[PDB]
Amino acid sequence: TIQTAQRCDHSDSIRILGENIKILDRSMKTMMETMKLMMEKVDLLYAST
Amino acid sequence: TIQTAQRCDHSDSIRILGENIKILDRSMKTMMETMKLMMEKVDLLYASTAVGTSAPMLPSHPAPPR
Amino acid sequence: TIQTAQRCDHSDSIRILGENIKILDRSMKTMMETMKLMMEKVDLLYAST
Amino acid sequence: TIQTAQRCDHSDSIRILGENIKILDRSMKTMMETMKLMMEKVDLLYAST
Amino acid sequence: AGINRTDQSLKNPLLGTEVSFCLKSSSLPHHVRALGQIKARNLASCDYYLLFRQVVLPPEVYPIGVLIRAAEAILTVIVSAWKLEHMTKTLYSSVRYALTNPRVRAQLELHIAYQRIVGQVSYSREADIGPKRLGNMSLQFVQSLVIATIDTTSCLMTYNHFLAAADTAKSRCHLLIASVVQGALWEQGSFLDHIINLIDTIDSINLPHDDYFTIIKSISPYSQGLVMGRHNVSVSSDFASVFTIPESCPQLDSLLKKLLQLDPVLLLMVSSVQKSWYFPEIRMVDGSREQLHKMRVELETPQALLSYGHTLLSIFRAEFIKGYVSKNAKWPPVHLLPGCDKSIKNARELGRWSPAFDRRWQLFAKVVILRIADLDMDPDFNDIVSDKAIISSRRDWVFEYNAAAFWKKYGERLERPPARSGPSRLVNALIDGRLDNIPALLEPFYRGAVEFEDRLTVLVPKEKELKVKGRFFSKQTLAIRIYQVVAEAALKNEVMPYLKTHSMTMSSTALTHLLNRLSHTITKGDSFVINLDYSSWCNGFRPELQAPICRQLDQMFNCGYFFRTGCTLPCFTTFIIQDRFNPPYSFRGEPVEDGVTCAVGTKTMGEGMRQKLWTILTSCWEIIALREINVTFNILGQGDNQTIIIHKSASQNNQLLAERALGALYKHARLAGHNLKVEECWVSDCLYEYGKKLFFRGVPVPGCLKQLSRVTDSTGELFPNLYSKLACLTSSCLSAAMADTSPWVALATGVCLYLIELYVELPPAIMQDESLLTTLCLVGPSIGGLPTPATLPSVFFRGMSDPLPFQLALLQTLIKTTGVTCSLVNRVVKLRIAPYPDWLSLVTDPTSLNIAQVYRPERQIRRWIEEAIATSSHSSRIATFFQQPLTEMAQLLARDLSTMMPLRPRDMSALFALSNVAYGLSIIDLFQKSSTVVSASQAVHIEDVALESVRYKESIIQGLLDTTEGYNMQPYLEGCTYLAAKQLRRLTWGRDLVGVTMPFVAEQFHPHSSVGAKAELYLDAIIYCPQETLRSHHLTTRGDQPLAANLVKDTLVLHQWYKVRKVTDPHLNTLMARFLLEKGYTSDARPSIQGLTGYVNILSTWLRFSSDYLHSFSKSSDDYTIHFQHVFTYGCLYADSVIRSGGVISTPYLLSASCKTCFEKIDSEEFVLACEPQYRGAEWLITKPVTVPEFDPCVSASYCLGILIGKSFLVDIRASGQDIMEQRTWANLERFSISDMQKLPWSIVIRSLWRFLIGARLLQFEKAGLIRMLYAATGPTFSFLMKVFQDSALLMDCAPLDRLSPRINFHSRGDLVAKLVLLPFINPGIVEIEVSGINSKYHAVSEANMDLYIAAAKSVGVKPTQFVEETNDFTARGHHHGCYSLSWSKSRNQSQVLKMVVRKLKLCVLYIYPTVDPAVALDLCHLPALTIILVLGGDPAYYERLLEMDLCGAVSSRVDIPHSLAARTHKGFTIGPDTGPGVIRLDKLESVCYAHPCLEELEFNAYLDSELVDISDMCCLPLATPCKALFRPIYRSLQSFRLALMDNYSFVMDLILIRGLDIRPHLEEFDELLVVGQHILGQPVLVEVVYYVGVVGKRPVLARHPWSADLKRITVGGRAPCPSAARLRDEDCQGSLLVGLPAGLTQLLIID
Ligand SMILES: [Zn+2]
Ligand SMILES: [Zn+2]
């Protein structure tokens, strides 16, 4: 009863995966930034044609 | 009974994780849009180069799923 | 006690968010392959000029 | 409460969610390396022109 | 050898490269023979029209007088059969004038000579056909090359040049005959002299080739510019100044200006012909170089074009989201980018489109539209098989060019492969199975790398166009054609219904409404028209403009890069131009770029490709240009031609607005790379063009000259034969008569052309026999003859028709009038019944017979093509589709449907239409009879069709010359043709056929005029009454009086139409269950769902026609065989024939019933399908299987009709003034019967209507609209409610209404209807009693199934009996009751003296002239034992107005209706003329006390027969229950009137608070009811009351003296105690009215 409800939940792993989701958010933000820079580069390529 | 229920309850936790994956999805759609705006200019430049020559049509999108 | 135990668990919500993160992985794979396809065209554009 | 205990079961789901988050993270690092290579290629445009 | 010169009409461009190759160094064997026969003076091939113009024949070479006599006989027979015998002299004199006039006869003889040379030379195995003489010209045919010589000059040309000359002669013959027949039947007279002058003027032009065709090209816009220059009133025009006709051809300018001076409509008719003159020879080097330049030319930079494409993406997103919110009530799946506006976010959450997003579309650069649908990568078989020729692969470019030309031009051979490396057509690609896997074929378009072998396009010049440098279409590889099919289907189905500008054009009703509003508005001064023409439209589109919207479309349909591969595809595609004898070079098997014949890569796909996307792009930039300057506009798009409607603004005039609009359109056209030339665009307020139709001042220009002079291709999917020529001629006349050309013009022209087409092909033995020619034109395909225009009733009518009674009537007229025996008819028809019944011919054509069709050209069709494709098919999609015999399954299903016990062929065909086998036979029909399937079916045994033509010709000559007779048709050419047609169908099929025989309308009704009509003609008659004397002015000026899996849906709807009229059979349910299983619906049950012909429409607005045929056919619920649209069209054709023959319509006319056996009571009968169906289903023909998700009727119909009428009144009050004059309703209220409304109990309907109005609980402005439009006689539904409530039986049967009628005081019948419909808002008092009768289950009955319940409401109920009330009868001596007759507001004494006179003279019949006041006539009708016969003279308006006033039914019982309509003069004892024998007259007496025991005082002394007869001694007799002539709503008792005084005081005080309603007329109603109060009040009645009204403290204070300053003065005059009911109602116990009186009512009681 108590041990079954202990088995069916893993709260510490929820906290670890939430921290890992935050890490994924940071990586998404830095990829958006480098897409913005190479957007600027391709735009100034296409302007000078 | 209540204490086991309160350590087993993660309504707020699962709602926070679901909302954060929704933030990931919105940022991914934004990146997809910017990448499409890159594809327009590079494909139009290559097609402008292609006129009058025998240059091949290179692929632009990978494959249909399954 | 019973309704609190209902509030503890949703297997379906965890399954929806698991499919929701798998489709984002699929989107990453499509963007990587498409960006390499862009790389081939810009390589031939370097070769042209 | 055996059937409610089987519907409580989350132990497989959190583990495979960790696998999904891990493979998403590896996919984003590989695409970021591809992004760096792509910037290195597209800077050669104004070197040539 | 092979067949030569295989065309009989022009179907190709005229090219001259072969002639130049022949003249300069050819070594081909036939080129030497062609070069040896030319003269020293040899003209160029482009000058061929210079040589063919000099051809002249000797006069009167063909004996065609028997044709003229036969044509006159045929037209006399048709006009006699229609029983319109006053047009008779007009039509045959038109034909006699045409064929006797020398120029028309010479053109006809030239046409016969040309067509006989074409018949002699075409489809021949002989390479060289010798000297063939055409007048002064001798022709020599050397394969493809023709040499023409007159005296010493020669022209070497191709065979297409000779066909162009023959087509010119054919078109001119058509034009001259059509001009003569149109000039005979039209208010302006003959214009044949102008046509001959036009032909001579164009034939007199001696200019070079390009200048000549410049004039011929510019002849139509110059004349349109002249008409616009003279007849624009609000805008300026400089369109005529562009063209150089005044300086190049002055005589043509003079002719067009004099045609402008006489008649602009004649100028627009004459100027629109463009193919009766010759055709250009295309300058291929210059035009080819110019096209290949225009496909790769940049007018705008790519960087600006991509930015403007982003701008167009914004407005595309805005319009798509507006459409999706309007239809689906929600925002689509969208992603909002960073920086999106907050208004977009709030409107997304609220699910609403704000009315400020239209001018702010730049906000939609941050709204990305996500997936909405999925791309359907499996086309159906309809678009796959037809309309294009294809190329298999790029190694097949070498089969479009000659090897000898490649050797002479370049010095080496072509290295042509032996085989053609695959199919050359779409259907052959199906049979070889290259189209088995469409998604695997379209996968390279998804990846964006289409394969190397698919990138070729051949540019082909178009034919019969006046451009000397040519216009080219695209012949493409199979893969790109499949891409075009998928992309155009996706954009047409999924995107464009949400785009409003395209969606109004796709819908027929919205387009019709828009064009009608444009027709009314242009003449008043608003809504001018801008016409924009894009000359370089298909060449102008560039990748950078298209790419962002293509990216959005690729994201919308989850297809990767599919819409974006078409933008960058032309940059990789090789383009060559189809010109044999001018080939491109080959280097390694591939074409070499030169700029004239080849181009490796361009920037546009071509013409016709990406048609749907380009329309969206053009519409987007036009919406940007017009929305930046704040105009109200409507865009009608026709691709390259765009018509813009601009409505007038209050601030600015039309010229300044037109200049601003033109500047905006030029600016935003230039930004897209599509520069508009100022010489090509124009503005107007008098002329526009839509749908290949030209409108001048809102009226369509006649198109008789253009349509009848058009040359069609003919001989479709067959060898050349006479039957196909007669069929295409008949179809051309039918298409003309449907497309707003006069029936008589098309009929006479078709008869003439039919006889000329017979004269070309038939020997002199047939053609010099007049009676055989007349019979052979009057037999027709209904009874097995040749296709003739004479036997079609579809020329004069628009709906579905039955040819067979009309055909038998024509042959009866032929035998009785013309000296033709029945033995000759037996000779010509040759009736041959089949030995066994072929039921498939009945399920395809219900009206057909089981006879042999012997002149029909034979392709086996049913089995040979199925065997051929099932044997030669080398892959799937044919093996799965044709795994079982389709024809044997079709015959098995036909035998199953022939077991119907009443055999109904219409329902039999309808049930056959819901089958898979019908779809399968349709796909086989597209494999037989379509475009580009002629290639396969003619190419298999390509030689044998030449011998088959000769065999068919010998067979038809031997058949027509045979003198033996067939089956005797004498029983079927006597008596009634309805019964004769039914007996012929029973003889020929073996069983009686129910439901397909429609009676002939000219036999059923005969027209007469009222000046000599008797009483017996008026028993069953349809009456037409004109408001004015009608002449030729009224034919053109409008008058006052008004005018896939979807089969599964049908599989249920017909099922519901079976189930509600109570047909029940196990076998039919089994059969429809098998249909539902074969189409994939395995669910057990689902219960879910005036105007005339256009040629008499304008004339119909001057006539009132009604249905007074009820004395024998419309007094019962039993339905009969009358189709009323045909009958009203026939009566209007009688009027049109009287006007167009030189007469006038000044009297009413009639259509009387003549043949009593054409009126059959229809047997509403169950049909039981006897045997068990052996069909078993297919399930292999529908490739897309649909999914399963994809009480008594009287009360339900009562509640549904109540809520439908209530919401119809609601959409009437929301409608504007221009919209309420239209008869459009919410759910099609007009086409409902009147009988089933009488069966329907209407008390339930009135409570449903009342409870829907109280459930709406409308705001004050809409309630003011309700009360205003119901107190007036406005709205179509008020007319509908009057037409329902015409009989007083529905009035008396309503059990709420007999209780309610003491309360309401009604001035008229419409006043009572208005009070009944809008009483719950003003009075809840009776609503408190009859609100209890509510049932929520009947409110939940849906509207969409309502019509099905309409099928059930007709049979259950019954109609009431009607009752005769009584008025004062007088006679003898008696007691005086009160002498009550019309005391309401009318001279009662006029009725009194006439009742006393008619009772003492003891008259049995009284005749009443329409000068007498109607209410006196109501009293004279309500007297018993008297027959009132009015003098109508054919006009039912007086009796109808007399009937509308009465509320009992004594006017409908005591008036003899045929004798009343058949009466013109004095015939008895009358009231109404001034002085004469038997005339009752009224003489004014100034002073008499009238010593009479009955009545108190006399005003009028009645005189009769110049004598006075003593009316002073009579008295009354007892009375009984009265009508509403005595007005029991205000009777002697006052407590009902005090309740009315309680209510009208409460009516006005509630209506003061109503916004938008100023209470003057409702206050006048209150004034009349308070005049009824002022009769009894007893305080002095002011004639003028100053009567201040105003609200104080939310309480309306209203009285004579102003209680406060804020009260408003209303001037009321004319109050006096004139009725005698003032003395009657004066009662005992005064102050009883004060008991239970409001203090305001007491204040109105005691005056000041
Ligand atoms: Zn008849
Ligand atoms: Zn009455």
Transcribe chain C into DSSP letters: -HHHHHHH--HHHHHHHHHHHHHHHHHHHHHHHHHHHHHHHHHHHHHH-
The alpha carbon of E1012 is separated from its chain's Cα centroid by a whole number of angstroms, namely 38
Subunit partners of chain D (3 or more CB pairs within 8 A):
A, C
Strands E1588-1592 and E1595-1599: antiparallel
Instruction: Write phi, then psi, for A14 (nearest 5 degrees).
Output: -60, -45
Neighbours of E778 (CB within 10 A): 25
Residue partners of E118: CB distance under 8 A and separation at least 6: E8, E163, E166
Measured between beta carbons, the chain A residues lying within 8 angstroms of B8 are 5, 8-9
C8 interfaces chain A, CB cutoff of 8 Å: yes
Same domain, E1442 and E1307: no
* Helices E88-100, E743-761: crossing angle, 10 deg rounding: 40
Note whether E796 and E1093 are within 8 A (CB).
yes
E1042-to-E513, E772, E886, E1081 alpha-carbon distances in Å: 16, 47, 51, 46
Neighbours of E1639 (CB within 10 A): 6
Look up residue E814 and give its amino acid: L
Look up residue E505 and give its amino acid: T
Give residue for tokens 């490796």. Answer: E600
Give the ligand whose atoms come closest to the C-alpha of residue E1528: 2
Q: How far apart are CA E399 and CA E412, in angstroms?
A: 16
Q: How far apart are CA E685 and CA E670, in angstroms?
A: 26
Per 3-state DSSP, chain D is made up of helix, strand and coil in percentages (nearest 5) of 90, 0, 10
Give residue for tokens 């509308």. Answer: E1444
Q: How far apart are CA E1521 and CA E396, in angstroms?
A: 98
Q: CA-based angle E186:E192:E197, to the nearest 5?
A: 145
Q: Do C25 and D23 touch (CB under 8 A)?
A: yes
For E558-654, strand residue ranges (E) read 574-577, 598-600, 633-638, 641-646
Within-domain flag for E232: yes
D13 interfaces chain A, CB cutoff of 8 Å: no
Note whether E1336 and E1561 are within 8 A (CB).
no
* Helices E1388-1400, E1414-1422: crossing angle, 10 deg rounding: 40
How far does A9 lie from chain C, in Å, by closest CA?
Answer: 9
Note whether B41 and C37 are within 8 A (CB).
no
Q: Helices (DSSP H) in E1285-1404: which residue ranges?
A: 1289-1293, 1295-1300, 1309-1317, 1319-1322, 1336-1339, 1346-1356, 1388-1400
Give residue for tokens 């047409």. Answer: E492
Note whether E1514 and E1400 are within 8 A (CB).
yes
Look up residue E189 and give its amino acid: G
Same domain, E1143 and E1222: no
Structure tokens given for D44: 């050669």
Structure tokens given for E361: 């579309």
Structure tokens given for E1539: 């309740």
Residue E364: DSSP 8-state: G
Same domain, E49 and E138: yes
To 10 degrees, the CA torsion angle through E1471, E1474, E1476, E1480?
A: 30
Structure tokens given for E676: 């508009």
Residue E940: DSSP 8-state: T
Q: How far apart are CA E100 and CA E104, in angstroms?
A: 8
Residue E1581 DSSP SS3: coil
Q: Helices (DSSP H) in E152-300: which residue ranges?
A: 159-184, 192-203, 209-231, 245-248, 250-262, 264-271, 284-294
Q: How far apart are CA E1505 and CA E1076, in angstroms?
A: 82
Q: CA-based angle E946:E951:E954, to the nearest 5?
A: 130
> HSE-up of E1198 (CA within 13 Å, CB side)?
23
Q: Write down how long chain D is.
A: 49
Q: Do D24 and C28 touch (CB under 8 A)?
A: yes
Same domain, E445 and E541: yes
Q: How far apart are CA E38 and CA E24, in angstroms?
A: 14
Structure tokens given for E129: 């056909």
Instruction: Write phi, then psi, for E619 (nearest 5 degrees).
Output: -65, -35
Spacing, Cα E1361 to ligand 2 middle (Å) = 14
The range of the structural domain enclosing residue E218 comes to 204-272
E111-to-E5, E169, E277, E566 alpha-carbon distances in Å: 19, 6, 14, 48
The alpha carbon of B37 is separated from its chain's Cα centroid by a whole number of angstroms, namely 14
Neighbours of B33 (CB within 10 A): 15
| Nearest Cα residue to E1396 out of E1498, E1507, E1478 | E1498
| Nearest Cα residue to E694 out of E684, E703, E685, E707 | E703
D32 interfaces chain C, CB cutoff of 8 Å: no
List E157's β-bridge partners, or say none: E146
Chain breaks in chain D (C to N over 2.5 A) after: none
Instruction: Write phi, then psi, for B9 (nearest 5 degrees).
Output: -80, 130
Task: Tell me how many helices (H) and strands (E) chain D has.
Answer: 3, 0
| Nearest Cα residue to E1139 out of E1284, E1036, E1257 | E1036
Residue E532 DSSP SS3: strand
Within-domain flag for E793: no
Give residue for tokens 């105690």. Answer: E1617
Neighbours of E176 (CB within 10 A): 24
To 10 degrees, the CA torsion angle through E967, E971, E973, E975?
A: -170
D23 interfaces chain A, CB cutoff of 8 Å: no
Look up residue E1187 and give its amino acid: T
Note whether E414 and E403 are within 8 A (CB).
yes
Same domain, E515 and E601: yes
The alpha carbon of E1303 is separated from its chain's Cα centroid by a whole number of angstroms, namely 49
* Resolution for this PDB entry, in angstroms: 2.7
Q: Helices (DSSP H) in E1179-1322: which residue ranges?
A: 1193-1214, 1217-1220, 1235-1239, 1243-1256, 1260-1271, 1276-1284, 1289-1293, 1295-1300, 1309-1317, 1319-1322
Measured between beta carbons, the chain A residues lying within 8 angstroms of D36 are 34
Spacing, Cα E1156 to ligand 1 middle (Å) = 7
Span between the terminal Cα atoms of chain B, in Å:
50
A8 interfaces chain C, CB cutoff of 8 Å: yes
Q: Which of B7, B13, B28 to mutate to test the interface with C (most CBs of C within 10 A)?
A: B28
Element (H, E) at E1471: strand E1470-1471
Same domain, E1338 and E1418: no
Spacing, Cα E976 to ligand 1 middle (Å) = 4
Q: How far apart are CA A22 and CA B12, in angstroms?
A: 16
Chains B and A touch (3+ CB pairs under 8 A): yes
| Sign of the torsion angle spanned by Cα atoms E162, E168, E174, E180 | negative
E184-to-D35, E92, E107, E179, E1556 alpha-carbon distances in Å: 83, 10, 20, 9, 58
| Sign of the torsion angle spanned by Cα atoms E922, E924, E927, E929 | negative
Span between the terminal Cα atoms of chain A, in Å:
73
List E1030's β-bridge partners, or say none: E1145
Same domain, E177 and E212: no
Neighbours of D10 (CB within 10 A): 22
E1094-to-E517, E1035, E1040, E1139 alpha-carbon distances in Å: 18, 12, 17, 17
Structure tokens given for E189: 């007279």
Q: How far apart are CA E1561 and CA E1582, in angstroms?
A: 20
Note whether E339 and E366 are within 8 A (CB).
yes
To 10 degrees, the CA torsion angle through D34, D38, D40, D46?
A: 180
For E789-905, strand residue ranges (E) read none
Note whether C31 and B32 are within 8 A (CB).
yes
A45 interfaces chain E, CB cutoff of 8 Å: no
Measured between beta carbons, the chain A residues lying within 8 angstroms of D43 are 41
Q: Please count the structural domains in chain E.
A: 9
Structure tokens given for E1196: 């339900």
Q: How far apart are CA D24 and CA C25, in angstroms?
A: 5
| Nearest Cα residue to C27 out of E90, B24, E1406, E729 | B24
Same domain, E1572 and E1426: no
Report CA Rg, chain B.
24
Q: Could you say which of C5, C35, C41 has the minimum Cβ distance to residue B46?
A: C41
Note whether E670 and E305 are within 8 A (CB).
no
To 10 degrees, the CA torsion angle through E596, E597, E603, E604?
A: 120
Neighbours of E359 (CB within 10 A): 10
Q: Which residues of E528-545 are buried (b: 16+ CB within 10 A; e: fewer)?
A: bbbbbebebbbbbbbbbb
Nearest chain B residue to C42, by CA: B42
Nearest chain B residue to A10, by CA: B8
The alpha carbon of B39 is separated from its chain's Cα centroid by a whole number of angstroms, namely 14
Chain breaks in chain B (C to N over 2.5 A) after: none
Give the ligand whose atoms come closest to the C-alpha of residue E981: 1
Note whether E1571 and E1557 are within 8 A (CB).
no
Structure tokens given for E850: 């089981």
> HSE-up of E336 (CA within 13 Å, CB side)?
15
Measured between beta carbons, the chain E residues lying within 8 angstroms of B54 are 600
How far does D6 lie from chain A, in Å, by closest CA?
Answer: 9
Q: How far apart are CA E596 and CA E592, in angstroms?
A: 11
Q: How far apart are CA E1562 and CA E1584, in angstroms?
A: 18
Q: Do B31 and A29 touch (CB under 8 A)?
A: no
Within-domain flag for E475: yes
To 10 degrees, the CA torsion angle through E979, E982, E983, E987?
A: 170
Note whether E1457 and E1018 are within 8 A (CB).
yes
Q: How far apart are CA C24 and CA C20, in angstroms?
A: 7
Per 3-state DSSP, chain B is made up of helix, strand and coil in percentages (nearest 5) of 70, 0, 30
Q: How far apart are CA E292 and CA E600, in angstroms?
A: 10
Q: What string of DSSP letters covers E255-271?
A: HHHHHHHH-HHHHHHHH
Give residue for tokens 């993270």. Answer: D25
E1513-to-E1372, E1420, E1484 alpha-carbon distances in Å: 8, 21, 20
Q: How far apart are CA E952 and CA E722, in angstroms?
A: 9
To 10 degrees, the CA torsion angle through E1216, E1217, E1219, E1223?
A: 130
Same domain, E408 and E473: yes
Structure tokens given for E1213: 């009050």
Spacing, Cα E888 to ligand 2 middle (Å) = 68
How far does A31 lie from chain D, in Å, by closest CA?
Answer: 7
Residue E45: DSSP 8-state: G
* Helices B11-50, E302-328: crossing angle, 10 deg rounding: 140
The alpha carbon of E1563 is separated from its chain's Cα centroid by a whole number of angstroms, namely 47
Note whether E1422 and E1448 are within 8 A (CB).
yes
Within-domain flag for E705: no
Same domain, E883 and E933: yes
Strands E682-684 and E641-646: unpaired
The alpha carbon of E828 is separated from its chain's Cα centroid by a whole number of angstroms, namely 38
Residue E337: DSSP 8-state: P
A26-to-A40, C19, E1448 alpha-carbon distances in Å: 22, 22, 90
Same domain, E565 and E597: yes
Residue partners of E1541: CB distance under 8 A and separation at least 6: E1569, E1570, E1573, E1641
Q: Helices (DSSP H) in E524-610: which residue ranges?
A: 537-540, 543-556, 565-568
E532-to-E98, E300, E535, E665, E678 alpha-carbon distances in Å: 41, 20, 10, 9, 10
Within-domain flag for E1054: no
Note whether E190 and E220 are within 8 A (CB).
no
Task: Output the 3-class SS for E395-444.
Answer: HHHHHCCCHHHHHHHHCCCCCCCCCCCCCCEHHHHHHCCCCCCHHHHHHH
Tell me whether residue E972 is exposed, middle or buried, using C-beta atoms within 10 angstroms of its C-beta: 0 to 12, 13 to 18, 19 or more: buried
Spacing, Cα E1516 to ligand 2 middle (Å) = 20
Within-domain flag for E1073: no
Within-domain flag for E197: no
Same domain, E513 and E613: yes
Q: Could you say which of D27, D35, D42 has the minimum Cβ distance to residue C42?
A: D42
How far does C24 lie from chain D, in Å, by closest CA?
Answer: 8
| Nearest Cα residue to E561 out of D26, C29, C38 | C38
Give residue for tokens 């008649």. Answer: E263
